[PDB]
Design a protein around this nucleic acid. Structure first.
Ligand SMILES: [Mg+2]
Length: 156
RNA sequence: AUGGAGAGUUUGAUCCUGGCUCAGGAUGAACGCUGGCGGCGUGCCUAAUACAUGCAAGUCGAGCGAACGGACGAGAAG
């Protein structure tokens, strides 16, 4: 499992004297073979925050249906104000994505896709929107089984 | 299918909303520094402001009369 630190953020809680600072780490973990997850970790130092985030991400993983390195179909993943449009591309296109979306897609193993963040650019909600889209993706075989037909009947 | 990336900035910290700003491409460009060559293009966007000077619409003698011109070659011998 490869892991990428998306963002590290120094948050503060106010106390009677001064402030208590902590580090929050958002991390994406993936095998580059259709499995991806994300996690957050809070600690007094960034290495420990990253370690906790990685453990949480490994706890939470999703399976991404793929077709030769790209998604089966266009999808818009939404979470809160996050919103990420994603569209299958052709080989050699590359991953046309910005910010946390690229982390999520590359670690999921997608190498050719087009995307656009249409909503909030706050990294955690961007990641959640991307994961929501990948979760709602569908594959031809599963939809054929659900609709009680064959792939050939599906495509006519 | 030939095709679509985002970032900074409101808070002690947060999410949202929201504007501002930046990274790209372009030009009949101008300016600053600098500047070797070749090829192909482009070059008063302003004052439809005023313009010295030269040139940018002539040609036809196989339409016509006239004028100039004077070969080829006549005559006298100074
Ligand atoms: Mg949680």
């Amino acid at each position: 499992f490869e892991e990428r630190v998306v963002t590290i953020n120094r948050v503060a809680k106010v106390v009677k004297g001064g402030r208590r600072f902590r580090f929050t780490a958002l991390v994406v973990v993936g095998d580059k073979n259709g499995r991806v997850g994300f996690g957050t970790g809070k600690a007094q130092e960034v290495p420990e925050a990253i370690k906790k985030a990685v453990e949480a991400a490994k706890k939470d993983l999703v399976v991404v249906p793929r077709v030769e390195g790209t998604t089966p179909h266009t999808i818009t993943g939404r979470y809160g104000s996050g919103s990420v449009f994603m569209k299958p591309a052709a080989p050699g296109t590359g991953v046309i994505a910005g910010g946390p979306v690229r982390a999520v897609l590359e670690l999921a193993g997608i190498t050719d896709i087009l995307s656009k963040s249409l909503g909030s650019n706050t990294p955690i909600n961007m990641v959640r929107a991307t994961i929501d889209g990948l979760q709602n993706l569908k594959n031809a075989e599963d939809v054929a089984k659900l609709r009680g037909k064959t792939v050939e009947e599906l495509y006519n």
